[PDB]
Design a protein around this motif. Structure first.
Motif, PDB file in Angstrom:
ATOM      1  N   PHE A   1       0.838  -1.202   0.000  1.00  0.00           N
ATOM      2  CA  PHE A   1       0.000   0.000   0.000  1.00  0.00           C
ATOM      3  C   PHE A   1       0.875   1.256   0.000  1.00  0.00           C
ATOM      4  N   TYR A   2       0.254   2.395  -0.269  1.00  0.00           N
ATOM      5  CA  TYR A   2       0.949   3.676  -0.188  1.00  0.00           C
ATOM      6  C   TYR A   2       0.854   4.319   1.192  1.00  0.00           C
ATOM      7  N   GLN A   3       1.900   5.068   1.518  1.00  0.00           N
ATOM      8  CA  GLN A   3       1.936   5.892   2.697  1.00  0.00           C
ATOM      9  C   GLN A   3       1.929   7.338   2.263  1.00  0.00           C
ATOM     10  N   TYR A   4       1.209   8.153   3.023  1.00  0.00           N
ATOM     11  CA  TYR A   4       1.280   9.609   2.903  1.00  0.00           C
ATOM     12  C   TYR A   4       2.083  10.156   4.089  1.00  0.00           C
ATOM     13  N   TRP A   5       3.100  10.963   3.793  1.00  0.00           N
ATOM     14  CA  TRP A   5       3.969  11.508   4.852  1.00  0.00           C
ATOM     15  C   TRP A   5       4.025  13.027   4.820  1.00  0.00           C
ATOM     16  N   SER A   6       3.837  13.678   5.982  1.00  0.00           N
ATOM     17  CA  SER A   6       4.309  15.059   6.222  1.00  0.00           C
ATOM     18  C   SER A   6       5.385  14.941   7.282  1.00  0.00           C
ATOM     19  N   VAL A   7       6.582  15.434   6.978  1.00  0.00           N
ATOM     20  CA  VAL A   7       7.721  15.287   7.884  1.00  0.00           C
ATOM     21  C   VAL A   7       8.244  16.690   8.218  1.00  0.00           C
ATOM     22  N   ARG A   8       8.106  17.105   9.482  1.00  0.00           N
ATOM     23  CA  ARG A   8       8.515  18.465   9.899  1.00  0.00           C
ATOM     24  C   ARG A   8      10.007  18.660   9.619  1.00  0.00           C
ATOM     25  N   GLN A   9      10.358  19.829   9.100  1.00  0.00           N
ATOM     26  CA  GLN A   9      11.744  20.154   8.733  1.00  0.00           C
ATOM     27  C   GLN A   9      12.643  20.324   9.959  1.00  0.00           C
ATOM     28  N   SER A  10      12.049  20.678  11.103  1.00  0.00           N
ATOM     29  CA  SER A  10      12.793  20.771  12.379  1.00  0.00           C
ATOM     30  C   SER A  10      12.026  19.902  13.375  1.00  0.00           C
ATOM     31  N   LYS A  11      12.724  19.227  14.281  1.00  0.00           N
ATOM     32  CA  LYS A  11      12.105  18.303  15.222  1.00  0.00           C
ATOM     33  C   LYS A  11      11.453  19.040  16.379  1.00  0.00           C
ATOM     34  N   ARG A  12      10.324  18.532  16.836  1.00  0.00           N
ATOM     35  CA  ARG A  12       9.762  19.012  18.083  1.00  0.00           C
ATOM     36  C   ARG A  12       8.929  17.943  18.761  1.00  0.00           C
ATOM     37  N   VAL A  13       8.762  18.109  20.070  1.00  0.00           N
ATOM     38  CA  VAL A  13       7.890  17.230  20.847  1.00  0.00           C
ATOM     39  C   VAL A  13       6.910  18.132  21.610  1.00  0.00           C
ATOM     40  N   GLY A  14       5.761  18.384  21.001  1.00  0.00           N
ATOM     41  CA  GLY A  14       4.687  19.105  21.684  1.00  0.00           C
ATOM     42  C   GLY A  14       4.148  20.251  20.876  1.00  0.00           C
ATOM     43  N   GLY A  15       2.819  20.337  20.820  1.00  0.00           N
ATOM     44  CA  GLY A  15       2.166  21.383  20.087  1.00  0.00           C
ATOM     45  C   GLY A  15       0.819  20.931  19.587  1.00  0.00           C
ATOM     46  N   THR A  16       0.319  21.645  18.594  1.00  0.00           N
ATOM     47  CA  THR A  16      -0.946  21.278  17.935  1.00  0.00           C
ATOM     48  C   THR A  16      -0.658  20.778  16.524  1.00  0.00           C
ATOM     49  N   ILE A  17      -1.459  19.824  16.057  1.00  0.00           N
ATOM     50  CA  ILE A  17      -1.389  19.398  14.666  1.00  0.00           C
ATOM     51  C   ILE A  17      -2.770  19.691  14.066  1.00  0.00           C
ATOM     52  N   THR A  18      -2.794  20.653  13.139  1.00  0.00           N
ATOM     53  CA  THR A  18      -4.006  21.063  12.402  1.00  0.00           C
ATOM     54  C   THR A  18      -4.142  20.140  11.188  1.00  0.00           C
ATOM     55  N   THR A  19      -4.776  18.996  11.437  1.00  0.00           N
ATOM     56  CA  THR A  19      -4.735  17.867  10.525  1.00  0.00           C
ATOM     57  C   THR A  19      -5.295  18.258   9.160  1.00  0.00           C
ATOM     58  N   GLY A  20      -6.331  19.106   9.147  1.00  0.00           N
ATOM     59  CA  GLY A  20      -6.948  19.545   7.905  1.00  0.00           C
ATOM     60  C   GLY A  20      -5.959  20.210   6.962  1.00  0.00           C
ATOM     61  N   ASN A  21      -4.981  20.947   7.504  1.00  0.00           N
ATOM     62  CA  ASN A  21      -3.945  21.585   6.659  1.00  0.00           C
ATOM     63  C   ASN A  21      -3.149  20.520   5.899  1.00  0.00           C
ATOM     64  N   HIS A  22      -2.791  19.451   6.601  1.00  0.00           N
ATOM     65  CA  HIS A  22      -2.094  18.312   5.964  1.00  0.00           C
ATOM     66  C   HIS A  22      -2.956  17.580   4.940  1.00  0.00           C
ATOM     67  N   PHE A  23      -4.167  17.216   5.321  1.00  0.00           N
ATOM     68  CA  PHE A  23      -5.047  16.500   4.381  1.00  0.00           C
ATOM     69  C   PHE A  23      -5.257  17.328   3.076  1.00  0.00           C
ATOM     70  N   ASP A  24      -5.480  18.630   3.230  1.00  0.00           N
ATOM     71  CA  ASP A  24      -5.654  19.526   2.091  1.00  0.00           C
ATOM     72  C   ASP A  24      -4.383  19.629   1.246  1.00  0.00           C
ATOM     73  N   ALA A  25      -3.215  19.783   1.889  1.00  0.00           N
ATOM     74  CA  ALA A  25      -1.935  19.814   1.132  1.00  0.00           C
ATOM     75  C   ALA A  25      -1.697  18.480   0.388  1.00  0.00           C
TER      76      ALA A  25
END
Length: 193
Positions: free
Chosen positions: A137-161
């Protein structure tokens, strides 16, 4: 009280869905704590993934805080699946030694979200564990350019992109703030929403 597991299973804990998965090698101590909190401690594993979240994903905004650490291969990511098409998707905020998905990913562009920038990739997994059994199967990836542990993920922004570059989702299955380990040892302590 906290409830700690070593065998792969799913269920509900303090109103949150959880999935704890591993193949046979090594040990994961996956612990379910107050509210949206879980912890993990893994050693000698081949592959494991688990966390708390939702039995059915959506465009909800997901907030999380805590810690994640491995001297080897592992990821801290919003993680989920869809069916028809079968897709394993990731919004990766941190990783250990190796930044996924590596050279087998097709880079498709970037999206800004939640004060970060994420690189978007498609990758294919061949005969890999999935929610329907071993599958290609295929994977869809968004990979942050800088690492972090903690915050909000606005999932709709990713799904739309993802949609704007042909990565269209199927019918939502589970959606968790996941810790994943690959041939490594490590720990995490993550509180979701």
């Amino acid at each position: 009280a906290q409830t700690c597991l070593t065998s792969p299973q799913t269920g509900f804990h303090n109103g949150f869905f959880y999935s704890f998965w591993k193949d046979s090698p090594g040990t994961v101590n996956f612990c379910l704590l107050e509210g949206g909190r879980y912890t993990s401690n893994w050693s000698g594993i081949n592959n494991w993934v688990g966390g708390k979240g939702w039995q059915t994903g959506s465009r909800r905004n997901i907030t999380y805080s805590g810690s994640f650490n491995t001297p080897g291969n592992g990821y801290l990511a919003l993680y989920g699946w869809t069916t028809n098409p079968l897709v394993e998707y990731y919004v990766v905020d941190s990783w250990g030694s190796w930044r996924p998905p590596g050279s087998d990913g097709t880079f498709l562009g970037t999206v800004n979200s939640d004060g970060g920038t994420y690189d978007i990739y498609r990758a294919q997994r061949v005969n890999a564990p999935s929610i329907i059994g071993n599958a290609t199967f295929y994977q869809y990836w968004s990979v942050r350019q800088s690492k972090r542990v903690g915050g909000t993920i606005t999932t709709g922004n990713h799904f739309d992109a993802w949609a704007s570059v042909g990565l269209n989702l199927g019918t939502h299955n589970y959606q968790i703030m996941a810790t994943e380990g690959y041939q490594s040892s490590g720990s995490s302590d993550i509180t979701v929403s």
